[PDB]
Design a protein. Structure first.
Lengths: 96, 145, 237, 96
């Protein structure tokens, strides 16, 4: 039995919410995997071609966060570069 | 041989029942009453739109020649036995010409704009109904056209 | 197109997010504005743009609304969902609804008899579609899948902390204990429930928008033997 | 409050993704029983599956919008609502 917080958005939005939203992104990818898999099974049960079910994939968004040069990667890379700051971090984001 | 001068004689007879001052004119308020007494069959909204095309107040009068115009207007747009059969046939559970006397009450008194307690009592006394079973509707097509 | 006279449509509103309206005249391309009859007045008018081929959201037919599963609707959009949940909750006091695989639980802020043991019996052995949606139906689905296949099972509960996730979990464990027939030996429920005040004291906080917000993922593994008798729980965080 | 909660629980986007595919579905016997209102007695054949195929391709000419599985017809968004609207129109005209 897993109890977890839902997606979060406020007037002022911060790292706590960013992390929460990333966890929710991951859970949503899993949810899409689970649903898409069960749909592929039902489609094969009903003999319907898989090419009709378009797969919506948030992997490009997860890659924007967790992968190399992702928003988290550049945050850690900024934490150990000398005199890094929220402003230059933001600049790296825009540049990248 | 419809709309010859012979048929117009009974149209003058039925019109004369509502021309109570006796001047060749009737009110809009009974125009449906006389048309359906003569057995021509318009809907409620259709009749109301035909009245309000003549007067936006709705409260008025129509002379005998223009009453014949309104009769002729409806006669141009007359139903058929198969068009009336189609209307019953969408409620046929089996496909044999029979409809439930329970669902008939739902069609008469809950669906559509509806039939009154008086219309129900009068029709049910003649039809003699005491039950909810399947009943022949090809009879209704023939007898009510 | 077929946006005809008497067609019902949704229009946005500030007090209640969406309002129902009735199309007072047939739409045709180039009829750039619609005559709409509202509950508040016989005609109030709404405008459409050539840009995007703009149209108001159409409304689902009445047979479909109020259904136990939101995927049964033909138009899938915000007002239809909101309406279905509003009606089921407000008029029928139904606090549970399905969406695809998901179970939606509406917090009533009140105790209800729906958690009784007779209902536990009523859900035991039933298939998912054979019953109206309830947390016991999710618990039963997991329990049957654990028995039918070796693969393990997880119930994931998501929402705000105020929504009452603990109650869902409490009843799911009680359901398992009861359908397993384990409560004549197991004493896990009493202790697991008695663990909540400490977990809330240590793992719970007051946020800008909520009081008693939970700030971690808590995983309770209810262990079973080879006969599906309960074994005492393992907690991970 | 509720719209925001529904957005936060991903319910709305889930529904949005679901709407791009065949979201609804009806068994052949059930569909035939619902839609005889839209079948003249010469449209009715010696098989309910083939009847539903010859009727549905006449009722919705756009062959993307639905698919015939082994035990169920499946539908995109809006298609069932169009069939029920047409059913309500036919029954309204008939009872009038």
């Amino acid at each position: 039995v897993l109890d977890i917080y839902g997606f979060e958005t406020f007037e002022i939005n911060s790292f706590e919410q960013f992390c929460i939203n990333y966890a929710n992104e991951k859970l949503q990818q899993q949810f899409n995997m689970h649903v898409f898999k069960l749909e592929q099974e039902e489609y094969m049960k009903e003999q319907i071609p898989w090419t009709l079910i378009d797969f919506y994939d948030n992997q490009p968004c997860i890659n924007l966060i967790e992968s190399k040069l992702g928003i988290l990667d550049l945050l850690d890379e900024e934490c150990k570069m000398p005199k890094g700051t929220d402003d230059t971090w933001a600049q790296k984001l825009y540049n990248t | 041989d419809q709309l010859t001068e012979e048929q117009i004689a009974e149209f003058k007879e039925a019109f004369s029942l509502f021309d109570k001052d006796g001047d060749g004119t009737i009110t809009t308020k009974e125009l449906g009453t006389v048309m359906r007494s003569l057995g021509q069959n318009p809907t409620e909204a259709e009749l109301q739109d035909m009245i309000n095309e003549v007067d936006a107040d709705g409260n008025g009068t129509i002379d005998f020649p223009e009453f014949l115009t309104m009769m002729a207007r409806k006669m141009k747009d007359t139903d058929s036995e198969e068009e009336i059969r189609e209307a019953f046939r969408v409620f046929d559970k089996d496909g044999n010409g029979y409809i439930s006397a329970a669902e008939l009450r739902h069609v008469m008194t809950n669906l559509g704009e509806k039939l009154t307690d008086e219309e129900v009592d009068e029709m049910i006394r003649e039809a003699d109904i005491d039950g909810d079973g399947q009943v022949n509707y090809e009879e209704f097509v023939q007898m009510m056209t | 197109e077929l946006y005809t006279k008497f067609a019902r449509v949704w229009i946005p509103d500030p007090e209640e997010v969406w309002k129902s309206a009735e199309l007072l005249k047939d739409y045709k391309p180039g009829d750039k504005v619609l005559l709409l009859h509202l509950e508040e007045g016989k005609d109030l008018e709404y405008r459409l743009d050539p840009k995007t081929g703009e149209l108001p959201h159409l409304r689902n037919p009445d047979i479909l609304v109020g259904e136990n599963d939101l995927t049964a609707l033909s138009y899938l959009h915000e007002p239809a969902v909101l309406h279905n949940l509003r009606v089921r909750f407000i008029d029928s006091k139904l606090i549970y609804t399905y969406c695809g695989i998901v179970l939606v639980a509406i917090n009533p802020y009140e105790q209800l008899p729906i958690y009784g043991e007779d209902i536990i019996n009523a859900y035991s052995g039933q298939n998912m579609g054979d019953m109206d949606p309830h947390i016991f139906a999710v618990a039963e689905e997991a329990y049957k899948q654990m028995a039918r296949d070796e693969r393990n099972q997880s119930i994931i509960v998501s929402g705000e902390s105020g929504a009452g996730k603990t109650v869902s979990a409490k009843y799911a464990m009680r359901y398992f204990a009861t359908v397993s027939g384990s409560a004549s030996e197991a004493n896990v429920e009493e202790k697991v429930l008695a663990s909540n005040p400490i977990m809330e004291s240590i793992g719970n906080a007051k946020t800008t928008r909520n009081d008693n917000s939970s700030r971690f993922g808590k995983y309770i593994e209810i262990g079973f033997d080879k006969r599906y008798r309960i074994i005492g729980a393992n907690m991970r965080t | 409050r509720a719209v925001q909660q529904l957005r936060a629980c991903g319910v709305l986007e889930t529904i949005r993704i679901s709407a791009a595919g065949f979201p609804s579905r009806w068994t052949y016997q059930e569909f035939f029983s619902r839609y005889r209102v839209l079948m003249k007695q010469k449209d009715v054949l010696g098989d309910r599956k083939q009847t539903c195929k010859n009727v549905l391709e006449k009722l919705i000419l756009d062959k993307d919008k639905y698919q015939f599985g082994k035990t169920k017809i499946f539908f995109r968004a809006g298609q069932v609502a169009y069939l029920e609207k047409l059913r309500a129109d036919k029954l309204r005209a008939a009872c009038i």
